Design a protein around this nucleic acid. Structure first.
Ligand code: VO4
Lengths: 52, 426
DNA sequence: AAAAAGACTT
DNA sequence: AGAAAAATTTTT
DNA sequence: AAAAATTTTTCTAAGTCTTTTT
């Protein structure tokens, strides 16, 4: 059995944490969230200097 | 005409409150009726013919020949009991699974799988095109005037129950859902989905306090199943944000909760002291709360249901945890605990046999009620959301390259979150 | 109070 | 929640 | 072009937790 990274990203991590860091380090969203999980989190996409 | 998260001062409705004003949808997509192949089996060497109903259930098992389930005794036993309930309606010689030879059906299945694999690219497009036509009236609903995707509109087909871990009902038949099994939830003024010709719905209701479009009761254990909206829908999104907003509100209440349970460590009330260690575990280790399970379920535990056998007290204030949790995923961890918690754990286990509960005077209800005293809506699952999110935040903030190198850095911060949560893939 | 139903997340 | 199917990309 | 590996999506089981019933 291996460590599974999907469950935490899908259910557990505030997606605004991921989106903030990805815009502040100029990493494209598409290399972290697939098309489907981007459509899950549209309220988080705009990713502004976010402090959880 | 804004989106709902650019809205100024919107009130997001909570569970059990009024959730919608209007709801329109087309109901559910039923799998195709069973098509018999008329292939016999052989029982004790003699050919045996089956009704379509017997044959369908025989085929379910036969087809699973290369799967680990097929060789498990509990699975085989539960299948055979299910199959015999059907067979026993008429006269037949079937008495022992060992004497049943499913090979003609298995071989039929291998021929059908080969025929499916060896269709042309144009043949597999005219098949994908015909099915997506069929699903199209069901993929969407209209919730308060907005079009939303529906997630699980395809009714579960019948099958042999695939229980995780050591599930006592693995192999049991999950029967075909009929229209008569399904309750439709829709708006009072909406067009009601038409049941298949000759059938009716269980009931049609108009409950504005729920978010589901249809419901049936599953035959394995009587578990209620629901057709609900896709995660892209606004009802899912809004409850999803509200969820993360409570984890953030916990962040600010956390210190006060810890000072509270650390005072409870010294309690002479046994419930209170147990409650304290449980909330210590849920806080520091992000355990699930662990509700009691029935005799017809796999034996798995979370916090409140840990037994003496699940912990081992080691030399230097170290607790070794070893237990199956949700999904029968093993949790293995050596944890250095507060000396006051380690001593309490010695008290909680001293003369007890391995199968006895550690927190015998604590249930999830008592724990979650106590938590409401610190913050509205606070419950044990919230610490898990809090722990996962705060772990990523902290890592970004105290451990700050190529676009690919910065991703490996992400993967590693994600991996730390997944380890804490004990998320595993085989 | 305790157990079951019920609806929602993971 | 993880398993499995299905889709897509990488290797050959 | 095929095969292999890898990621993504679909599927439904398995939890949590509040409300309702006894
Ligand atoms: O409970 V979910 O990991």
């Amino acid at each position: 059995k291996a460590v599974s990274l999907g469950t935490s990203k899908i259910n557990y991590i505030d997606p605004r944490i991921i989106c903030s860091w990805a815009k502040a380090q100029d990493v494209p969203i598409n290399k972290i969230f697939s098309a489907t999980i981007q459509k899950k989190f549209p309220w988080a996409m705009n990713a502004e200097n976010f402090d959880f | 005409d804004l989106n709902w998260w650019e809205q100024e001062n919107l009130r997001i409705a909570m569970k059990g409150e009024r959730r919608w004003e209007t709801l329109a949808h087309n109901g559910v997509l039923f799998p195709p009726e069973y098509e018999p192949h008329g292939i016999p089996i052989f029982y004790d060497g003699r050919e045996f013919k089956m009704t379509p109903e017997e044959e369908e259930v025989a085929t379910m098992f036969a087809v699973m020949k290369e799967h680990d389930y097929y060789r498990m005794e509990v699975f085989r036993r539960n299948f055979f009991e299910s199959w015999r309930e059907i067979l026993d309606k008429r006269q037949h010689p079937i008495r022992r699974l060992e004497l049943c030879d499913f090979e003609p059906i298995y071989q039929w299945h291998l021929v059908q799988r080969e025929k499916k694999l060896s269709r042309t690219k144009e043949e597999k497009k005219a098949i994908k095109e015909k099915q997506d036509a069929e699903a199209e009236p069901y993929r969407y609903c209209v919730w308060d005037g907005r079009r939303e995707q529906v997630a699980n509109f395809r009714v579960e087909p019948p099958g042999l129950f695939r229980g995780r871990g050591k599930h006592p009902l693995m192999g049991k038949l999950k029967v075909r859902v009929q229209p008569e099994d399904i309750t439709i939830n829709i708006g009072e003024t909406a067009e009601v989905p038409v049941p298949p010709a000759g059938h009716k719905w269980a009931a049609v209701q108009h409950d504005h306090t729920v978010t589901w479009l249809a419901m049936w009761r599953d035959s394995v254990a009587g578990n209620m199943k629901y057709v609900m909206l896709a995660p892209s829908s606004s009802v899912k999104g809004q409850s999803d944000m509200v969820k993360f907003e409570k984890a953030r509100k916990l962040k600010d209440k956390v210190d006060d909760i810890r000072a509270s349970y650390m005072e409870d460590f010294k309690s002479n009330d046994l419930h209170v002291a147990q409650r304290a260690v449980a909330m210590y575990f849920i806080d520091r280790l992000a355990l699930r709360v662990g509700n009691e399970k029935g005799e017809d379920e796999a034996d798995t535990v979370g916090c409140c249901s840990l037994r003496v056998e699940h912990i081992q007290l080691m030399p230097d204030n170290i607790v070794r945890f070893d237990f199956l949790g949700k999904d029968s995923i093993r949790y293995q961890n050596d944890v250095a605990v507060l000396p006051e918690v380690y001593a309490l754990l010695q008290r909680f286990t001293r003369r007890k046999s391995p199968g006895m509960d550690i927190f015998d005077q604590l249930n999830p209800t008592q724990l979650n009620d106590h938590l409401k005293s610190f913050m509205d809506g606070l419950s044990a699952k919230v610490f898990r959301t809090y722990n996962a999110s705060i772990t990523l935040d902290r890592w970004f903030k105290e451990k700050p390259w190529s676009t690919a190198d910065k991703l490996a850095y992400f993967n590693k911060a994600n991996t730390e979150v997944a380890i804490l949560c004990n998320h595993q893939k085989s």
